[PDB]
């Protein structure tokens, strides 16, 4: 007998492979597994981990986000790496010339980058260009912006978006939502 | 039929399974209950300090 | 609690700025080892003086060997013990060659006759009665007569084997 100080046979709780069955994603994972093992590159390790992430953990990164990251001081010539989808944004009117490595590009995002005069490369092209992740800039989309997230932690005085199908007057706004009907929240 | 009324038996074991958690101290704690006069003036003091620190980059 | 050795145990009532060099109290403790000797020392010092193990220290512990381990002595032993219903003082006499053997006999005898365990007995005093005719217990006095002889009737020899072929004898 052993007085265990922790749960026995506990799984790490982190993905060690993508749940996806995409053969090309698995090939990318094989490449970056090799790189992360035999380069000592923190970039390679974090990209390998990012290649496992589920869809909601890979929120899209827009060309606007890329442009702001490049407006960062000294980042103007760094290659932007997005392990996920790069989406287009018409709210910007001056996109810079840059190199973006991403899992996927929207038609509009690819068009905007190429029209600005840059290149859209895949992550294996990125691995060939910078096996240690030289001069890279890893961008991540706004995870805590999902519609599902605003319902998380619902409760009194939390301000957290009740789960509701129909919105408007007569829909969860009377008793418990104002001091004139019983109480407020 | 009468039944048990109350006991704290097993409650500490239940609470310690996931452990009693210290409440994650933060720097810059909230100013929720702080005196509103102090807060009203603190907003102006901070806006002025921000303006001064901005202008101080010449 | 086992075969006994006698230890002198000297403790201090640890010095402070007020009282340097405290008064070095000593006891003769019959115990089977030194851990028990020091434990008994602290037990009796806490019965006697305002001190405890945490506020004192053991200055020394030394086994005391019998000065004449091969001469038969008569010991007077004064004990204090707790019965099931009270505390009592007792005086007994034990014939043996050493204080440790006398004390072991005393513990056996207290257990046998009064069901007094080790924890219930205090050895107040053990002293050799130097002069016979100061032996005051007949069960010892009968062994001090001149030219003492006695047979050992009905000798029972133990067989090494299950069966015997002779219908044995108890002569001696």
């Amino acid at each position: 007998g052993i007085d265990h100080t922790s749960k026995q046979h506990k799984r790490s709780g982190h993905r060690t492979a993508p749940k996806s069955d995409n053969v090309y994603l698995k090939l990318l994972v094989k490449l970056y597994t090799f790189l992360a093992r035999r380069t000592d590159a923190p970039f390679n390790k974090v990209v390998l981990k990012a290649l496992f992430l589920s869809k909601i953990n890979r929120p899209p990164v827009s060309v606007s986000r890329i442009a702001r990251a490049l407006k960062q001081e000294g980042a103007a010539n760094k290659t932007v790496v997005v392990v996920g989808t790069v989406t287009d944004d018409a709210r910007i009117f001056e996109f810079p010339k840059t190199t973006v490595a991403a899992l996927r590009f929207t038609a509009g995002a690819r068009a905007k980058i190429v029209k600005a005069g840059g290149e859209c490369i895949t992550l294996d092209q990125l691995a060939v260009r910078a096996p240690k992740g030289q001069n890279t800039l890893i961008l991540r989309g706004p995870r805590n912006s999902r519609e599902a997230v605003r319902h998380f932690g619902m409760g009194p005085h939390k301000g957290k978006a009740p789960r509701i199908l129909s919105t408007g007057r007569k829909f969860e706004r009377a008793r418990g939502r104002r001091r004139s009907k019983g109480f407020k929240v | 039929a009468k039944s048990k009324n109350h006991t704290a038996h097993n409650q500490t074991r239940k609470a310690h399974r996931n452990g009693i958690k210290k409440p994650k101290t933060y720097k810059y704690p909230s100013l929720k209950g702080v005196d509103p006069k102090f807060r009203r003036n603190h907003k102006h003091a901070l806006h002025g300090t921000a303006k001064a620190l901005a202008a101080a980059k010449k | 609690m086992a075969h006994f050795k006698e230890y002198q145990v000297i403790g201090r009532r640890l010095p402070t700025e007020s009282v340097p060099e405290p008064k070095l109290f000593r006891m003769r403790i019959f115990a089977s080892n030194e851990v028990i000797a020091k434990s008994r020392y602290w037990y009796f010092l806490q019965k006697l003086h305002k001190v405890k193990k945490a506020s004192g220290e053991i200055v020394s512990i030394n086994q005391i060997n019998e000065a004449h381990p091969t001469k038969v002595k008569n010991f007077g032993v004064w004990v204090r013990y707790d019965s099931r219903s009270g505390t009592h003082n007792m005086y007994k006499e034990i014939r043996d060659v050493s204080r440790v053997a006398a004390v072991e006999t005393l513990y056996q005898d207290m257990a046998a006759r009064h069901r007094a365990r080790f924890r219930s007995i205090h050895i107040l005093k053990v002293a050799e009665i130097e002069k016979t005719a100061d032996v005051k217990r007949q069960y010892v006095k009968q062994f001090l007569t001149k030219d003492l002889k006695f047979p050992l009737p009905h000798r029972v020899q133990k067989s090494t084997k299950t069966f015997s072929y002779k219908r044995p004898s108890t002569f001696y």
């Binding site: 007998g1 052993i2 100080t5 | - | 000297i10 053991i58 020394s60």
Partner: protein, 183 residues
Amino acid sequence: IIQAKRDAKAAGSYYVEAQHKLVFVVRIKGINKIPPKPRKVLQLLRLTRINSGTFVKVTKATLELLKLIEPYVAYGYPSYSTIRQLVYKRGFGKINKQRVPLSDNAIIEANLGKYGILSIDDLIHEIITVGPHFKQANNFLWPFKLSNPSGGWGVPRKFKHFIQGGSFGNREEFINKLVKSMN
């Protein structure tokens, strides 16, 4: 030490030897029905299994732990021979924690060499003399997994104090015999 004792006796004084700086503690109680505070103290002394042993540097803060766990452990003052035999036969180190046997001095140097400990005898020295890096050397030592004693416990019942004819508590110098029979 021997000469100081003799000289004090010759001068009519008493040489009060220094208090012991090192104890070896062995958990002699199973893992069932332990009150929470003693159980936590046992886990913090890494005695999470019966017949597991660790070295503890004696201070007030650790003496008050031994006091709490007394009915579940036998402990005492380990000799150089006992420590040497423990480390030689049952010495294991924590390297990615990986319970690595101390079969070569290269492992000891690779993990404790930053403290000046280059060999198994350097480790034994840092244990017996409670050195500046005793905490790191002792924690690097995996808790010793001893067997039951080979000639028995010497008592019919283990779970009263050593003073009361049992096995637990401080048995100060007899811990060497117990551990030698357990090793």
